[PDB]
């Protein structure tokens, strides 16, 4: 028998399967093809020991340092929620190895906590902010408010979009800010908090099990008649698909349209996830299937398992995804991945995203002398 390449990757399965259940089967669709093709490094083996996190910091570091010490895995991956990558992040910089995180977004992970042994692939707060600001900044409207989960994420979401809409825009004020605890959402007090302040335009940052209860209780109120809407993640299939035909029309949105993604690369992607899982993708099984494609081709580009020649390797290295090449930046360890902008709209009686455009990940990212400044100086 052949060693295994072991990768340690802890993550919420237990709080958010709405994303995570599809990011799995995104993973192990990855892991079964690689195995397949002949595994890594003269025919090794590519296993992943996963954990759960219970959506918690402590947990999330116990369960990477009960990898490490008890199974020997070669790096760790993962994590859903902002403030649980930056202490998975933290640990691995004590211990010397490698986290590639995959769907935690705060840039902090990348610039002000950034270090050496984090890289991290969903296009940031700050990526997806300028996306969103830019197109904010089109709207001939200048009051805005802002609703967000109170915790890493969504106090890195609102800081960016507020930053790049201001810069843009000088005379746009923000006349209010609701910090609704995650998962705690108390709908009724915060909609007419937003409704006194007479916004023109909403920024909304709410995902997963938040998003309908503001959405119901919005249009309930009268939040959204005559308003702009720009909503985080609010396009992705496994935020939008549960609302049915209650799914906001005209939000301005990033998301994930694969059922409209006619590229090659893609579709097979599509089918090939159809295939094994007999489900349609979501955007975490993207997110899933390109964690592990870029981690074997670190591996492989490495020519070994030794912890710092493989943070080394992956500095500006490119790998295959189903929407092209992608990279990961040696000045901030960002890979390239864009994201979907376009608006919502019901189509038979279905959520969806119409007048979309991809935005790579490079097109809005500060230059690479600009990122490296804003990382730790050790
Ligand atoms: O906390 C995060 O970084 C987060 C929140 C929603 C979706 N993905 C990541």
Same mark, same amino acid.
């Given at each position: 028998?052949?060693?295994?390449? #072991? ?23 990855? /892991? ?45 991956? !993962? ?13 691995? %910089? ?110 909304? /940052? ?15 109120? !009268? ?52 295939? %094994? ?63 979907? /902008?376009?608006?919502?709209?019901? #189509?038979? !009686?279905?959520?969806?995203? /119409? ?19 804003? %990382?730790?100086?050790?």
């Amino acid at each position: 028998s052949l060693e295994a390449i #072991r990768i340690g990757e802890i993550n919420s399965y237990s709080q958010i399967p709405a994303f995570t259940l599809p990011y799995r089967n995104g993973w192990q669709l990855a /892991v079964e093809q690689i195995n397949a093709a002949g595994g890594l490094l003269g025919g090794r083996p590519l296993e992943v020991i996963s954990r759960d996190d219970g959506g918690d910091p402590g947990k999330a570091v116990t369960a990477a340092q009960e990898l490490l010490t008890r199974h020997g895995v070669h790096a760790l991956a !993962g994590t859903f929620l902002s403030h649980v990558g930056l202490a998975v992040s933290d640990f691995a %910089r004590q211990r010397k190895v490698l986290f590639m995180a995959s769907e935690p977004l705060t840039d902090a992970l990348t610039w002000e906590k950034g270090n050496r042994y984090t890289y991290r692939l969903r296009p940031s707060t700050y990526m997806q902010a300028a996306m969103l600001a830019a197109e904010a900044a089109k709207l001939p409207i200048t009051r805005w408010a802002t609703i967000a989960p109170n915790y890493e994420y969504g106090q890195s979401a609102v800081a960016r979009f507020k930053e790049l809409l201001l810069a843009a825009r000088p005379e746009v004020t923000f006349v209010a800010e609701q910090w609704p605890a995650l998962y705690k959402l108390d709908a009724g007090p915060t909609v007419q908090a937003l409704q006194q302040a007479e916004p023109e335009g909403l920024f909304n /940052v709410l995902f997963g099990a938040d998003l309908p209860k503001f959405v119901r209780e919005g249009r309930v109120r !009268g939040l959204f008649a005559g308003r702009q809407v720009v909503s985080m993640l609010t396009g992705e299939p496994e935020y939008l698909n549960p609302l049915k035909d209650e799914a906001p029309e005209g939000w301005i949105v990033t998301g994930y349209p694969w059922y409209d993604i006619d590229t090659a690369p893609h579709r097979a992607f599509v089918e090939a996830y159809r295939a %094994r899982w007999k489900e349609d993708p979501f955007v975490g099984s993207l997110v899933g299937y390109n964690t592990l494609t870029a981690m074997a081709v670190a591996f492989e580009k490495a020519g070994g398992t030794e912890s710092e020649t493989l943070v080394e390797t992956l500095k500006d290295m490119a790998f295959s995804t189903p929407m092209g090449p992608l990279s990961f930046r040696a000045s901030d360890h960002q890979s390239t991945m864009g994201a979907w /902008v376009g608006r919502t709209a019901l #189509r038979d !009686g279905k959520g969806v995203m /119409v007048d979309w455009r991809y935005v790579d990940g490079g097109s809005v990212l500060p230059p690479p002398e600009v990122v490296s400044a804003w %990382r730790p100086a050790g």
